[model samples]
Every structure is written in structure tokens, then in C-alpha cells.
Target: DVSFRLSGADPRSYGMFIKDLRNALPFREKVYNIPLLLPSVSGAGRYLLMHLFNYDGKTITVAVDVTNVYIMGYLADTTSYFFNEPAAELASQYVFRDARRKITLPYSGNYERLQIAAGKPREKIPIGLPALDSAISTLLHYDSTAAAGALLVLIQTTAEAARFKYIEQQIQERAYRDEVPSLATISLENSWSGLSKQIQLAQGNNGIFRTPIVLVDNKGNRVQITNVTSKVVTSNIQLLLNTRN
Candidate 1:
């Protein structure tokens, strides 16, 4: 009767709590002699959208999926008890306590838990571009760390495939590893579907606009390089990397 999708680095660590939760919330309740009533499950939709972030402030947390607690608290009759204690107490007792005990993090909740290589830090690439519109067709919809002076190649076809290979070889020939800020590629084809809108906004145009390469400077400025040739892109990358803040 219910399905769930969990997100975050260690979602599976939440274990059976997430498993049992599907049947726990009553979307429709059977009241004696009355038609089934639409229950508090209606609010469950937005709870999935909620995120809990750590102090490093980039990665999303997964240990506690609280929708079960949220909906159960909503269904409780707090007005009758007036002590304001039942929902928290009852839900924890009937629903969360066992699951809380079941969690399996490696260290204290405040400290970092996993470490082979430290987490890949995220750079917030500012969206300083615009796109399509309505009413006039002008409704505008639109990272720092190393790779700060990076290059992101937008690949949708073999044209970019050929270019990326050459650019990589050039970087290998000319620059030291760290001196060359990171180079990466992402596909713009349909099932990477979400990226189409993102690149559209980044390119500041509409239908299937392909710039093929974006050069990000240390100051978080993005220059969509339209010339897809390897020589031009490699030349620009060297210039940007050499001119750092």
C-alpha cells in the first residue's frame, strides 16, 4: 500500500525503521460504522522533500526519516489529553524506539562517520545566468574548492567526445596534476534529463542549446565556451588556471 524512496549517503543504515514505516501510517482509517475517513497521511508528501544537513553544511543526512513520527503525531488527539505529552511519548514508544536503537553509525552523532578518503567537498557554483520567459516568453528560470579553475565539458555527442580526448591529452602534456584544476564531463542527453534545464539556464537560451564546454574560474564565474575545438578549449583552460585569485 505504500512505497518509499530514501536519499542521503547512508540511507540503508536506517534499516527496518524505514522498512516498517510504509505500513505504519494509515492513509485511510476505518471508523466504526462510518465510511473510511481520509487520514492525516495527506501531509506525508512534503516530508520527503525535507533535508537534514550536517555542519560541514553540504552533505544531506540519512539516519532519521521522520515522516513516520510526523504523521503519527498529527493523528494523535492532543486536545483530549491537554497534557501535550501523548504524541511524542506514544509515537516514540510505539514507533520509533526500536528503530532508534537499530541505527548503526560508526562514531558519535556529532563526528564524521566514514573515512577512507574524506568526503568529496561540494562547490556551490552560483547560477549567474538566465533563460526563457512567459507573458513575453522571457520568464527567467535560473564552487569554490579546487576544480575551482576547473573545466566541465558538456557532452551530448561524439563531437565533444573527440574534443575532450584531445583536451585531456593536452592537459597531461602541459600541467601538473593539481595545477590543472579538475576536468570532468556530463552528458546532456535525455535521461540525464534534469541537466537539460540546468544547461539551458547556464547557456541562457532555450531548446537544446549545446555550448559543449564551461570554464569556471576561481571567482565562481562561468564562461560557456562555444568553440568546441580541443585547441581552443585547452588554450582557454591554461589561461584561466594560470590567472587565479
Candidate 2:
């Protein structure tokens, strides 16, 4: 008996294998067990992608609650429209020319102009997510010494699955809504991004080490990157700049 290696079978399990076995299984709204192999991007480390791009060595705080991060999805949802089937419809739009920060896309259903749909996220079966927080747990990421964090989820009943349009519209409209307490889109809190996100940059270690990160302050903001004042606070997102070790 190999004991299954605890990592399951999928190679992508490299990201979640450790935690899933030793820790999780506490069960959130239900038994929080991942029956499938999710992408490495689906792990708590995924949040590192958000910080590495914005790394300035400063503490961060995510301003998202029950909607979307920072943009406040419901209010920000109006900018784009859901296309029936856009021209190849991959590129949506970016806030800037080199827009790394996501402003609006899923709502547009067009990564076009500037899109990346390598991950299929519109199925009733949960493989991916808008925030990916379901898999990116704060308890798992922070592990210990966490300040504050938040998560978003679509509370629902299996019967309400059939929607007219496909993709996100198939769910988001009904998914993120605040109407149903028993079944509503919710942004939860009391949990956990940063981290040194990079293939080009890190303290020294190469790919051999992937830093567990939390959300980061917008890199666009002017940062000090060193010991500074304490009275003035910055970035609202929380992450473990040092955890893996």
C-alpha cells in the first residue's frame, strides 16, 4: 500500500497535496474536500501571482468583501456587457496598456483585445472560480499569524443551475447576487496574499522555491520598500512574505 503518497495522482497536486492531507477537511459551509486535481494556480499560492506582480516589500490589505476585489463587482459590473459569442471573444479590455490588474473581463466575456481563457470557469461543477478563494484558503496560506482577510462564494441550490446564457452568465448573475442568505453570492471574512511573485525576481532561490503569498497593494502606488513610519498604514491585502520555509 503506497498510502496514495497523500498527494493524490495529478502532477498539479504538487501545489495542494501537503495541506489537503495534514490540515484541511475542517469543512466550511460543507465538507471542504477537493475531490479533483485543481491547477497549481488554484492553490493558496495563486494569490502570490497577485503580489509578485506588485511586490514592493510592503504589507497589503485587500479591500474586497462579498462582491469582487477592490472594484466592488456589483457597482463595477456595468462597464462591460455579456456578448452572446464575441469574435473569438477572448480579449476584453485593460485599464491600461500593460494592465496586469483586472478591471473588467468576465462581465465582458471578452478577454479579447486582451484575454486569457486557458482556464474554463463557467461550469456548474466547481473547477475554477472568479476569486479562486474557495481553494485559496486563508487558514491554509497564513497557517499562522494572520491579520485579516476575505473570501467570495456563490451560495446556491442545485436546482437553480439552469440559466439561459453560458459561461459566467450561466452562474454569476444568480451566483453573486445578495438575495438569498441560504443561497446567495457571498464575500466572507476573518481570514487571509503577498508575496514575492516571480520567475524573474526573488530573494535568491529559483523555481526550486515558490513563496506562499497573499494579496498585495497595487504596485502602481508609490511605495517606500523599506523600514518607515508606523502610524500611516497602506495596502489592505494580507499575505505571507515568509511561510514556505
Candidate 3:
């Protein structure tokens, strides 16, 4: 809901760095390329996180496509691992030291490590029933102009129901709050049958297993947000929602 431009740094190069980070995924071939519509970072420090820690000798950059913003921070770490806040203005010494401390903590998953690095307070995302569907159906039909209105529709088959519920929590707590997409889980067989087919077509008729996550904009344009881990899915959704086409 806030407006800001990426100033002081080379935005073009920053854009390319994000592209590079997307390509760095271990399952790169399975990833989808969703256009960033009205692209902007939540924090400039996300940019600095990449610059402060280089990968493969090339200075890392930040970009978001159909990918997870936090996990990219993990892939960028040469140290094998690991955004917002007024603390974005903190000293590089404390920032870098904090990163080392967070990265070294045991039991913290990939998502939480980046959360710590980003200076956000932590809370748990719990898995439960897919209650997001009706809310999404409501958002889909509403003509809201106050927000950018990106919708992340999870297209899963009935068999993946368990996995769907787990990721649904991530979407509701993480991605939804990140102010990217309005979230929903729809089954190719159990719900929203027609939209599932359309999402299928958008992914070039790819199997739902291959293209489980689809992004629909306020304008009704659709694209795939490639599947791998929930982290990858969440990252890609962040990119798609935050960046410009």
C-alpha cells in the first residue's frame, strides 16, 4: 500500500540480479516465469543482502518472478545459507554480524532464517483446513482499486490435498501478509473446475502436478508459479506479485 522507487542503485542491474537468483534454484528447469506487475522491493536491504553476500564470485542481485524472495536469500549465501525494517538503515557491521548469527542457528528452517535476516518479528504459520477458498472467490469478484490485486490460486488434485493444506498456511500467513497475492486453494477435481482448466491452458496444458500454482491478476491474466518446495512456490509468488511485467 506504500509507494517507493528503487533509487541509488542500478535498478536494471538489480533486476538482473533477481533474474539470476531465480535461475539459481536447484530445480530451475521446473520453475515458471511469471511477470512482475508493478515491481518494488519491501526493503532496500533485500538488495543489500544480495550484495553483501556474493555467490559464485558474481555480485548477487534481487529480482522476483514466479519464485520465493526469502529462499533466494538462502541460495545467495556462499556460507550455505541465508529484509524489511527501519533496521534497513543499520550499519553493515551489525547487519552482517546479525546475518551470521541467524544463519548459524539450528532448527530454524529456510523461511525463518530469512525472516530473521529481514528484521521481522517471528510467528508460526499453522496448517489446517483450506478456509481461504471463499475469501478468494470474494476477492476475485470484487472490483477493488485500492490494491494491486494479485491472486495466487493453488491448483491441486485431490491426491495432493495434504500438501495443499500445508502450503495453504504459508500462503495465508507469509505471502498474503507480504502483501502480494490474495490466497486460495482449488482442486482441479473438487472445486472451481472451469478455472482449473483455464489455468491448465495458461500453463500450456501442463499437468497440474507440474504447474500446481497459478497466478491470476485483477485483469484476469494467468501464469504458472512453478512448483518445487513451498519455499520455492512462496518465493516465486513474491516475485510475480512484486515485480512489473
Each model's number of backbone clashes?
5, 30, 16
Best by TM-score: 3
**Candidate 2 least-lDDT 10 residues:** 156-165
Ranking by TM-score: 3, 1, 2
Over the stretch 1-245, how does candidate 3's per-residue lDDT look in tens digits? 01112222232333343345433332212224433322332433333233321121222222211222321222222322222222222222223343323222122223334334324322222221122222223222222220011111111111122122323333334322232222343221122223222333445544233335554432345555443333323332322322121
Off by over 4 Å in 2: 1-115, 118-220, 228-235, 239-242
Task: Give the least accurate 10-residue stretch of model 1, judged by summed lDDT.
Answer: 127-136
- Order the candidates by lDDT, highest first — what do you get? 3, 1, 2
Clashing pairs in 1: 124-143, 133-137, 133-138, 133-139, 134-139
TM-score of 1: 0.17
The sequence of per-residue lDDT tens digits that candidate 1 reaches over residues 79-157 is 1100123333343333323232322112221101111112331122211001000100110000111111111111111
How much lDDT does each candidate structure score?
Answer: 0.23, 0.21, 0.28
- Candidate of highest lDDT: 3
What would you estimate as the lDDT of candidate 2? 0.21
